[PDB]
Design a protein around this ligand. Structure first.
Ligand code: FBT
Ligand code: FBT
Ligand code: BGC
Ligand code: BGC
Ligand code: GLC
Ligand code: ZN
Length: 257
């Protein structure tokens, strides 16, 4: 199966997922000087007050914090989006060292990690239907840099010892994802794809300009997770990021002047 190693990583994915070489792949480098303010963007609304987290899962690639998306409880609206997008899960991508780990880059700069809050367009009824549509998903991306600790991340960090290996899950109720957001909602947006197989071109990306700070100790705990299953030789879960892909016939728009 696909992964991040030398023999099954991003440079190999195209052989089973030919869309890997497609016209709107993600992530991309965000050239901050070429990105243009877009007055047609509406105010962005992140409405997570009633979010219901359920479970945290090590899926062998990353860990997902899953939400009850059976009804409109945490949603994303506004900005570039037409209609209502429901939060289904969040996860991260990170590096083996602080100097890499993000998927998007900013003027070629790599951050230590990147948080993805994944939402599906409720007009399509379910996630599987949404990923058949050009506007099926919206992913809110947030960069992580290493400095002061992020208090709202600590509950995540502290459960990771219980989901060390692929296929393990744990209860993760009553987690507030609002504690993972920076102060500012300034953002860049562009049309793209899932960054892992199946690489489907369904995503409106909304990437916040302001990174959150996390402590070295917090990201070191991410790096103690395992790609492998229980009992198998240890492969540390690190460098689970896809590099930037060609921008092709796209423009990145900014929410800020
Ligand atoms: N294309 S891919 O990354 O999914 C892949 C490989 F490259 C190699 C082996 C199995 C496999 F699934
Ligand atoms: N990393 S990402 O947010 O683009 C993403 C998802 F949300 C869901 C599935 C695959 C995937 F790649
Ligand atoms: O427990 C995490 C969050 O869950 C939500 O459903 C509640 O409405 C919030 O008040 C709370 O912060
Ligand atoms: O033709 C002019 C237009 O070109 C487009 O590529 C830009 O996105 C618009 O902002 C601009 O008004
Ligand atoms: O909020 C997420 C989780 O944080 C802590 O692990 C709590 O002990 C647990 O009860 C809760 O589910
Ligand atoms: Zn992701």
């Amino acid at each position: 199966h696909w992964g991040y190693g030398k023999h099954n990583g991003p440079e190999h994915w195209h052989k089973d997922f030919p869309i890997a070489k497609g016209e709107r792949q993600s992530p991309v480098d965000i050239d901050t000087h070429t990105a243009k303010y877009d007055p047609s963007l509406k105010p962005l609304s992140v409405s997570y007050d009633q979010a219901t987290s359920l479970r945290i899962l090590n899926n062998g690639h990353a860990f997902n914090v899953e939400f009850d998306d059976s009804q409109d409880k945490a949603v994303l609206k506004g900005g570039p989006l037409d209609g209502t997008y429901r939060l289904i899960q969040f996860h991260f991508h990170w590096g083996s060292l602080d100097g890499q780990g993000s998927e998007h880059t900013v003027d070629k700069k790599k951050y230590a990690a990147e948080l993805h809050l994944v939402h599906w367009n409720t007009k399509y009824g379910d996630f599987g239907k949404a990923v058949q549509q050009p506007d099926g998903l919206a992913v809110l991306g947030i960069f992580l840099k290493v400095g002061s600790a992020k208090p709202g991340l600590q509950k995540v960090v502290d459960v990771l010892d219980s989901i060390k290996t692929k296929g393990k899950s744990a209860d993760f109720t009553n987690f507030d994802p609002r504690g993972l957001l920076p102060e500012s909602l300034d953002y860049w947006t562009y049309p793209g794809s899932l960054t892992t197989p199946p690489l489907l071109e369904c995503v409106t990306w909304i990437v916040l300009k302001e990174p959150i700070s996390v402590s070295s100790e917090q990201v070191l705990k991410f790096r103690k997770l395992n790609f492998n299953g229980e009992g198998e030789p240890e492969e540390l879960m690190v460098d689970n990021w896809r590099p930037a892909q060609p921008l092709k016939n796209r423009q990145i728009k900014a929410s800020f002047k």
